């Protein structure tokens, strides 16, 4: 069982520390169930984001092995370019040997410039891995470095320390009642089938059901813009002059819960979770983002959702386990 504690940065981003090389070079990376590649800034990167983040220097490692494979990945937030290399990666006290990862060359954008983390560590299926690069968890499993082919995530609230990624285990004390298992619907992302969304006996969105993904890498709850608008309406969010989707903090005490039906079990989200409160400003936890796939317009169950449900990702079984947090 590997134990990777995670930093809770303003309830928006959660990142943990990893070591790469011998002796280890330390990096912070976001633990994303929405991607599958592992990558960190390198000495080969001249970009601005690379000038205010720790850079991996392969010349300093005795266990580094180069390759001529190039890497190019585009996210909803930007792009990155680099090369693949193999080295030992320390993650959650586990020494993941002969792990392929990318050395960045370019990281264009002010988004990475600003980010508190240095790289990303993907936790989704190998099927969405750029360059076919073996993901960290697969490599742990392939070398018998973990006992069970699963990982579990506990994300804290209120900026408290305590969020964790448990590689090859479940911590029965982080949840209540029993774990409910949902079949993965499409293996790429941790994609599941969302039955409906409801407010007081009424189906406010995703009628006849839809497709959602469980993503630790996304802060809010996203859906197609058209359906998000209906929800925004139903909870009292209105667009302010500076773009924001402001809401009256009083609504928190007054609004009902939005219930997500997954495989037939009801998963309530309380106004306390879906409205964000920061010094007198309360805003919506819902966001408009058309994420057109083949099998639809995706809904992203982001940190807003995850912080309320302990989540287990099971690759043995291809299932998602959810239980209300303790």
Method: X-ray
Give the closest residue to 79 by CA, choosing from 130, 12, 15: 130
What is the token pair recorded at 84?
């693949």
Q: Give, in order, the Cα–Cα distances in Å from 13 to each of 6, 9, 158, 177, 282.
A: 9, 5, 12, 28, 19
1-170 and 171-326: same fold?
yes
Rg (CA), the chain: 20
Among 271, 268, 266, 299, smallest CA distance to 285 is for 271
Neighbours of 294 (CB within 10 A): 5
CATH 3.30.160.100 fits 171-326, yes or no: no
> How many Å from the N-terminal Cα to the C-terminal Cα in the chain?
21
The verdict on whether 215 is a catalytic residue reads: yes
Render 214-281 in DSSP notation, one character per residue.
Answer: E-TT--SEEE-HHHHHHHHHHHT-EE-TTS-EEE-THHHHH---EEEEETTEEEEE-HHHHEEEETTE
Please state the domain extents for the chain: 1-170, 171-326
3-state secondary structure of 124: coil
CATH code assigned to 1-170: 2.40.70.10
Output DSSP code: residue 133.
P
* CA 160 – CA 98 distance, rounded (Å): 34
Catalytically annotated residue among 87, 138, 195, 215 = 215
Q: Decide if 205 contacts 223 (C-beta within 8 A).
A: yes
Q: Which of 32, 138, 195, 303 is catalytic?
A: 32
d(CA 255, CA 286): 15
Residue 259, CA distances (Å) to 18, 24, 195 in order: 37, 45, 10
ω into 23 cis (within 30 of 0): yes
Closest CA to 298 of 190, 183, 203, 152: 190
278 a catalytic residue: no
- Separation of alpha carbons 320 and 48, rounded Å: 38
């Amino acid at each position: 069982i590997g134990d990777e504690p995670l930093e809770n940065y303003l309830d928006t981003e959660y990142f943990g520390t990893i070591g790469i090389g011998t002796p280890a070079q330390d990096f912070t990376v976001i633990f994303d169930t929405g991607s599958s590649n592992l990558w960190v800034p390198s000495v080969y990167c001249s970009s601005l984001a690379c000038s205010d983040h720790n850079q991996f220097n392969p010349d300093d490692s005795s266990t580094f092995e180069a390759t001529s494979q190039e890497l190019s990945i585009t996210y909803g937030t930007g792009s990155m370019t680099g090369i693949l290399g193999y080295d030992t990666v320390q993650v959650g006290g586990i020494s993941d040997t002969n792990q392929i990862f990318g050395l960045s060359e370019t990281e264009p954008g002010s988004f990475l410039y600003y980010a508190p983390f240095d790289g990303i560590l993907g936790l989704a299926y190998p099927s969405i891995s750029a360059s076919g690069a073996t993901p960290v968890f697969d490599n742990l499993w392939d070398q018998g470095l973990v006992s069970q082919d699963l990982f579990s995530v506990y994300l804290s609230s209120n900026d408290d320390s305590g969020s964790v990624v448990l590689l090859g285990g479940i911590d029965s004390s982080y949840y209540t009642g029993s774990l409910n298992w949902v079949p993965v619907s499409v293996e790429g992302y941790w994609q599941i089938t969302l039955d409906s969304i409801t407010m007081d006996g009424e189906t406010i969105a995703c009628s006849g059901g839809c497709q959602a993904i469980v993503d630790t890498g996304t802060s809010l709850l996203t859906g197609p813009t058209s359906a998000i608008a209906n929800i925004q309406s139903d909870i009292g969010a209105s667009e302010n002059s500076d773009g924001e989707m402001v809401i009256s903090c009083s609504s928190i005490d007054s609004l009902p819960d939005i219930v997500f039906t997954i495989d037939g079990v009801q998963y309530p989200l309380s106004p306390s979770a879906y409205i964000l409160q920061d010094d007198d400003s309360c805003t919506s936890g819902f966001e408009g983002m058309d994420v057109p796939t083949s099998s639809g317009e995706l809904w992203i169950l982001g940190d807003v959702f995850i912080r309320q449900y302990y989540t287990v990702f099971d690759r043995a079984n291809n299932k998602v386990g959810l239980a209300p947090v303790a």
